[PDB]
Structures are given as structure tokens and as C-alpha cells.
Design goal:
binds protoporphyrin IX containing FE; homodimer; 11 helices; binds zinc ion; 34% helix; alpha+beta; Bovine Endothelial Nitric Oxide Synthase Heme Domain, Chain: A,domain 3; binds N~5~-(N-methoxycarbamimidoyl)-L-ornithine; 3 domains; binds 5,6,7,8-tetrahydrobiopterin; 407 residues; four-stranded mixed sheet; Nitric Oxide Synthase, Chain A, domain 1; Nitric Oxide Synthase,Heme Domain, Chain A, domain 2; Nitric oxide synthase 1 (chain B)
Chain lengths: 407, 411
């Protein structure tokens, strides 16, 4: 029940013990592996609070100290009295950093301890949420020198006073179904774009329209806000060798800022907790640009290169893919906007894994998400065995608010 | 119980019921997923249920379930097991068994082809020379002058575990690897240990970069013996590029016939420890893994140099650029020489059609995403976007330990 992981390129073996601390379930069983599946009260709360505070006090090397026993006693009194409890700033910061640390799908976790935590638990209105979010956007963007940050709105109470950001990311492009039957802009965002339009947003109906924020404070109906354009750093996409690439009219935004997940710390649930780092190049150039269900540009690019598109075995798709990804990196680099290539990021993740094995006894990692969507086996993560398991504090999926909201 | 899998590109949802017929364990639990781990004798008692389960599956597939012929066969195997402690498969059951081991192989992207498999029954084989002859016949048949035909040759099953038939090679055709005194490797680094064994057993190594290894063949638990495959039977393809004329001067070639020879075939509880099988290549096996893994031929640098790529920063994606050109060269070379090969786009697209068919007609298709997704260009192939369920069905191909680690030497 101590487990080994081997790297098949280097023969390095690591022993995992951290998995024994894992609490939540994976979706797998002895009979079936679900590794490739995308989405697999008072009495409940006190064990969860205890588990967390124990790890917190252990981390500041004060386990079993009076300050430990006193905080446990105090929270226990507070749950008994109010049915919830409030985290100290120090615990909140620890919790959020560790939720990133525990994120098994995240290749960038070498950065986990450098996270700016913005405490927005005093927020009461959607206007206040807009303010906090602009401040986060501007802080994280930092004129292109990106800095990781999370903004944490008030925790769930009875479940009818939820804070939610309706957007899937703070910054994303609109998608529109056309009379044609084709899609203009980002097909991933068609339904959300419709909810915005139906809410009064007037869309430019273009290929790259930054969506408005749709913010829900305290379980109320959500409200629209335009992020000031000067706060949205975008990069026009050009190629260092192909003069025609810029005519494709492509651009992307600099700040990736996931805003639809739920942060769980010590059993408390932070349903609105937008966080941001910076992009790995493949996210935009392979997935956002080349997925069939996304901007799906492989065909237009291949044509401009004059490749033989008659047969798959000419590898015309693969050739265009490499070029598109070269252009994304070149463009962010030329404009001084932080970006990481898939070679650099995966090399750092292997080094992080070794650190975590050494100092913590393991590192939960989901191979299916960690290996980049191009050139998998030429990155070292491909050859690295990983164990996937669930630790808390964590980031969790939650259902989309419109399926849940009672208007 | 019903399990759904979704394709995130097409929104197609499929429903799996076949997993209920799975008995063997995956390595995962409720608390841990071991989906990326490469590797996560038998009483007369345990043997009859395994035989029964298999014969029920066979008679079902032939629309003869519960027939007198089905009942008499169960009775006959039962009597044979308690009398002799094992049993012999009928030829038709052996064919059925081997095809199904392939159909059930969750790591295999080529399974659309599963019902087209030439089964060579070598269970009358007794000596290593006999094994050599069977294997030459398999190679010549499978090769078919470049028009590759899938095949398997099945040597006698395990009895007491002391008389095993084993092919010590990991594939029938592979290149020697040699560790040099300065610590560099000549040839294929994957085959260094095996190469050292062959040399010790008496092989005279030419010591070049692409020396076809001799066969090392163990019959009936005896010490293994060396044999040279006749060079006329080993089809190879020199690698060149359609636009880059310097590519040929890299001196690269590869063999046409991929023939895995170290796995164990389990049918109805019987263990076939020597069961070499062969199909044809998907391009990336050679052009991505065999050529570009750091632990294999490792040609990325030398190629990118010749392409004059910017090699001072990884973010130029020089490695990715060279990678694509190499893989073009491999497909171009095989196609030009009329040797069967499949590109990763074709193969994955075919797999998805296979998988959808299997859900509809079989109730499922166990698949290992980690292995199914190609090692380059993952997300522009449809399998990247397909959720899969991995579980183990019998008959099956299984790993077994390398024979030099377990063999009792007779001297
Ligand atoms: C600093 C730069 C960072 C890099 C380069 C990075 C890298 C990545 C990449 C490439 C993915 C996969 C995204 C996808 O395929 O959609 C990912 C997922 C994830 N990342 Fe990180 N990350 C970074 C910062 C962070 C921060 C600051 C947090 C939290 C505070 C975090 C938490 C996660 C989570 C929870 C997922 C899974 C999201 C999902 O399931 O959709 N990341 N990250
Ligand atoms: C017909 C042409 C075939 C193609 C294109 C094909 C394709 C592949 C590929 C690309 C892999 C992964 C190989 C690797 O990474 O090492 C594989 C694995 C496998 N294939 Fe197929 N295959 C074919 C025929 C067959 C046949 C005839 C059998 C058995 C009768 C078979 C059984 C398997 C098994 C058991 C594995 C897993 C091997 C392992 O775990 O090392 N394949 N196949
Ligand atoms: C079905 C499959 O799990 C799905 O396509 C996954 C595969 N790996 C991934 N990996 C990352 N980083 N992001 C993703 O969206 C996905 N999608
Ligand atoms: C550690 C990891 O499981 C290992 O490198 C796997 C990944 N996927 C693979 N997929 C295929 N087809 N072949 C392989 O050898 C591997 N290697
Ligand atoms: C730092 O934030 N994490 C990321 N690098 N990406 C988060 C998700 C972004 C998404 N894959 C996208 O391509 O927009
Ligand atoms: C037909 O056999 N199936 C294959 N396509 N490959 C089997 C294993 C071959 C191995 N990956 C190789 O590169 O030599
Ligand atoms: Zn699993």
C-alpha cells in the first residue's frame, strides 16, 4: 500500500505515501478504470474542519500545541452555535495555495506557493464583485508580466445565497449561431452568449468579442458588466516566417482566468473563486484554435501554406499545427506577455513532482490532462507514471448556474 | 448497471454493459487511479470454471448455446480436467480464442481488423528447431512481399510451469543494441540486455546500427537456442523524405513486420506462453517512439540540425518541427515501397468507427486512452476527445516476466 511510480525514460522510481491521506473517491473501481472520463449539515462539517486545521497546524510546525487545541475548540463552539465557521486569513491563504497544490490536472503547480490571495469575503453586491474582479484582472495582468492570483467571495451558507460568476473564465470570446448554420466566434460559448444577449448585452456579433461579466451576489439574479477594455490585454497573432499569417485575423487574450469552479477548504464551499495564472502555448494554439468544435482553423491555415490536403498521410494537419503553435508563442513573446511552451512547462512539472515526492511523499497527477495535446511523447511527462487521487483543500467542478438558478 | 461514455467533439453518448462480464482486476480503486502505470501452476479446481465460462462464450457466438454439442463438450472437458488436470482446445476454439484475445486488447488501436487473423496452430511443436521453422513460415506468410497479413503462431500451452515454450526475443524482428565502453550506445538501446544475452549464448554480432537480432527459442523448458532468420525473409525499408534529399544520408531504415513475441495468451484458463503475433505498423510507432524517444535512436537533434532550425530555445518548437518531418518520411518510405502502413489519422478514425460498432453489437469496447491516443498530435485525432472505459476481458494477452529472470538453466 506504499506505491511506486517509474519514469520509463530515466528509470527513476519514486515511492508514494501521500495517497493514503486521500479522502474523496476517484470514479474507478477494481473492475473498471474511468481515468479518461471528464466528469467522474452540522455533523458532516466538524470532521472536515478538524482534518484541515490539523494539516494547517502541522504545516506551521505547531501540531498538538495549545494554539492548535484552542482553535479546534473555538471552531467547534462556532459550528455548534452557528452551523458554520469562518476561516482566519492565514488559514484561507493556506487553503487556497493547497487547493492549487492538490490540483491533479494542473501542469503548472511548480508555482503553487506564489499565489496572491484576494479576500473578498466582505463582498455583498454584484457591483462589489465587479470591482474586486477588475482589481484582480489588473493586478494579475501587470502589463503583461502576469502574476498568479485568486479572488475569494463569501462561502456558501444555506445554499440559496450563493455567490457565482456565471462566466466560465473572466475573459472569453462570444459565440453566435448563424442563419448559415455555421458558428461565428467561439462555439464553446454559444449558450452563455445567448444568456448574455437575452439579458440585454448588445453583441458586436464579431469573431473575437470579449464577453461581459455576469455576476451573481448572494443568490440574487446575475447582472451584466463590461470589463474596461484597457484592462483586457490581447495579442494579435503573427508568424516569424509567414508574412500572410496576420491576415487570418487571429488574436487571443493574455489572462487565463477560470471562474466556474468551487474551492473547498475545511469543508467550507467557496462557489465564486476566480483564479488566474498564465497560458501554456498549446492551450490556445492546439485546443482553442484547432479543435474541430472550437475555432477549427486547421483547414484555412493548411490552404495558405499550400500543403497537399488530399491524403491524411502527408501529415498536412500536423504540419499546420506546429506552425500555428510557433505563431502563438512568437506573438505573446514579441508583445512581452508571459507564456510558457509545452516543453518548458512539462520539464518544470517533472522537477516539481520530484520536489513533492521528496518533501511531501507524493504528488497527485492526472496523466490524461498533464501530457500536452501535441507532441506528447517528446515531452518528459509522457514517460512518467502518475498516481491520480483526490486531496483537500481542492478545486471541484460544480453545475452551471443557469441549470440551478431559480429566477 | 449502465455506464455512459461521451465524445466531447461530437456529443455522441455510448452505453456500456459489457463491463459487467469483466472479472479480472484493473489496479485502480475507489481511492486511487492507476490508469497511467505501465504494469499495474493453476489448480484443477480454478480451471473448470474458467473453461466453462469460455465454452459458454464460444457456443453462444456460434448460436449453439445449450445444445447437445455444447453440453457434451462441457462434459468432455470436465472429464479431461479431472483425469489429466488440464485440457486441449479444439482447433475452432483456439481460433475463436486468439481472435478474441485481440478483440479484447484494450491497448490496441488496430482492433477494427480483429476478425481477420491467420491462426497457425503449432501445438504439435517439440523442439527449438521446430519453433524456428514455424516462425520462419509465419514471417514469410505475414510479410507477403509487403502486403502484410495479420497472423499468430501458437506453441504448446503451459503444463507444470517447468516445460514452458518461450520466444526470448521481445519481437521476432528487432535491431541489436550495444553499450560502448565510453558509455554511448550503438543501435537500439531498448535491446542492449537481450543483445548481451545472445552474444553470451554464442551469437557473432556484426556490431552496426541496424543488425537484425537472432531468434533465441526455448522449447519444452529446455535451454534456449540461437537461430538466424534467413535475410531474404526480413523485409526492410530505407527511410527517405519526399522533399528533403539529405534525409537518406542519415542512414535510417526500419523493418516492415512488427511481431510482438513476449506476451502470454490466456484462453479458457490455459496459458500459451509462446504466441508471437504480427500485424502492420502505425507510422508513429517508428517515427515518434522508435526514432525520437531519448532512450531509443534519439534522432531529433541530428535531424533539426540538417533542417537548420533555431535550436537555441525550445519555444521555436524545433523538436516538434523535426518530429513531423520524420514521420512524413516514414509514411512516404513505406508507401513508396508498397509495404503496408497506416497513419495515425486513418488508424484513430477507424478505431472510433470500430468502437461505435462494438458498443452497438457487443455492448462495449474496453480501451486504454493512455495507449490509444497517438504519441504526437494527440488532440487533432478523434480518440483524444473520446471517453473510454478500461477493463479486462478474457481471452486476453498478458505480460509475463522476461524469461532470463526466471529460467532454470540445465547447462
Ligand atoms: C502560473 C501558470 C499556470 C500554468 C502554466 C498552468 C497550467 C495549466 C494547464 C495547461 C491546465 C489544463 C487546462 C485545460 O486543458 O483546459 C491547467 C488546469 C488547471 N489548473 Fe493550472 N496553471 C497555472 C496556474 C494555476 C493557478 C494559479 C491555479 C489555481 C489557483 C490553477 C489550477 C488548475 C485547475 C484547478 C485546473 C483544472 C481545470 C479544469 O479541470 O478545467 N492553475 N493548468
Ligand atoms: C493489424 C495491424 C495492427 C495495428 C496498426 C495495431 C496497432 C497497435 C499499436 C499502435 C499499439 C501500441 C504499440 C506500442 O506502443 O508499442 C498496439 C498494441 C497492441 N496490439 Fe495491436 N495493432 C495491429 C494488430 C494486432 C494484432 C494482429 C494483435 C494480436 C493478434 C494485436 C494486439 C495488441 C496487443 C496485445 C497490444 C498491447 C501491446 C503491449 O501492451 O505492449 N495488434 N497495436
Ligand atoms: C475525453 C478526454 O478525457 C478529454 O478529451 C480530455 C483529455 N485530456 C485533456 N487534457 C487537458 N489538459 N484538457 C482537456 O480538456 C482534456 N480533455
Ligand atoms: C508512463 C506511461 O503510461 C507510458 O509512458 C506509456 C504512455 N502511453 C503509451 N502508449 C503507447 N501506445 N505505447 C506506450 O509505450 C505508451 N507508454
Ligand atoms: C493559468 O491558468 N491556467 C491555464 N494556463 N489555463 C486555464 C484554462 C484555460 C483554457 N485551457 C483556455 O485555453 O482558455
Ligand atoms: C501489428 O503489431 N502491432 C503493431 N502495430 N505494433 C506492435 C508493437 C510494435 C512496437 N511499437 C514497435 O515500434 O516496434
Ligand atoms: Zn483508474
Amino acid at each position: 500500500r506504499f506505491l511506486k511510480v517509474k519514469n520509463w525514460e530515466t528509470d527513476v522510481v519514486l515511492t508514494d505515501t501521500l495517497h493514503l491521506k486521500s479522502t474523496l473517491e476517484t470514479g474507478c473501481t477494481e473492475h473498471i478504470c474511468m481515468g479518461s472520463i471528464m466528469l467522474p449539515t452540522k455533523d458532516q462539517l466538524f470532521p472536515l474542519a478538524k482534518e484541515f486545521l490539523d494539516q494547517y497546524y502541522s504545516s506551521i510546525k505547531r501540531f498538538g500545541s495549545k494554539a492548535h487545541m484552542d482553535r479546534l475548540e473555538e471552531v467547534n463552539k462556532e459550528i455548534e452555535s452557528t452551523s458554520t465557521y469562518q476561516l482566519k486569513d492565514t488559514e484561507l491563504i493556506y487553503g487556497a495555495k493547497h487547493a492549487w497544490r492538490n490540483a491533479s490536472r494542473c501542469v503548472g503547480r511548480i508555482q503553487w506557493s506564489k499565489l496572491q490571495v484576494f479576500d473578498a469575503r466582505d463582498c455583498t453586491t454584484a457591483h462589489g464583485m465587479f470591482n474586486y474582479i477588475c482589481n484582480h484582472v489588473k493586478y494579475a495582468t501587470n502589463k503583461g508580466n502576469l502574476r498568479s492570483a485568486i479572488t475569494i467571495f463569501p462561502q456558501r451558507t444555506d445554499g440559496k445565497h450563493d455567490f457565482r460568476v456565471w462566466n466560465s473564465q473572466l475573459i472569453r470570446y462570444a459565440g453566435y449561431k448563424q442563419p448559415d448554420g455555421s458558428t461565428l466566434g467561439d462555439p464553446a460559448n454559444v449558450q452563455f452568449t445567448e444568456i448574455c444577449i437575452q439579458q440585454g448585452w448588445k453583441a458586436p456579433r464579431g469573431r473575437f468579442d470579449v464577453l461581459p461579466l455576469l455576476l451573481q451576489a448572494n443568490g440574487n439574479d446575475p447582472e451584466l458588466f463590461q470589463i474596461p477594455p484597457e484592462l483586457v490585454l490581447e495579442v494579435p497573432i503573427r508568424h516569424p516566417k509567414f508574412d500572410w499569417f496576420k491576415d487570418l485575423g487571429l488574436k487571443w487574450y493574455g489572462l487565463p482566468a477560470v471562474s466556474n469552479m468551487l474551492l473547498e477548504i475545511g469543508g467550507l464551499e467557496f462557489s465564486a473563486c476566480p483564479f488566474s495564472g498564465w497560458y501554456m502555448g498549446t492551450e490556445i494554439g492546439v485546443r482553442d484554435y484547432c479543435d474541430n468544435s472550437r475555432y477549427n482553423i486547421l483547414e484555412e491555415v493548411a490552404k495558405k501554406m499550400d500543403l497537399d490536403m488530399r491524403k491524411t498521410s502527408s501529415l498536412w494537419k500536423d504540419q499546420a499545427l506546429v506552425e500555428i503553435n510557433i505563431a502563438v508563442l512568437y506573438s505573446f513573446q514579441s508583445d512581452k506577455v508571459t507564456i510558457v511552451d509545452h516543453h518548458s512547462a512539462t520539464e518544470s512539472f517533472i522537477k516539481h513532482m520530484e520536489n513533492e515526492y521528496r518533501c511531501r511523499g507524493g504528488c497527485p497527477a492526472d496523466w490524461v490532462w498533464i501530457v500536452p495535446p501535441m507532441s506528447g511523447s517528446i515531452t518528459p511527462v509522457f514517460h512518467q507514471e502518475m498516481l491520480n487521487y483526490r486531496l483537500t483543500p481542492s478545486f471541484e467542478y460544480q453545475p452551471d448556474p443557469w441549470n440551478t438558478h431559480v429566477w
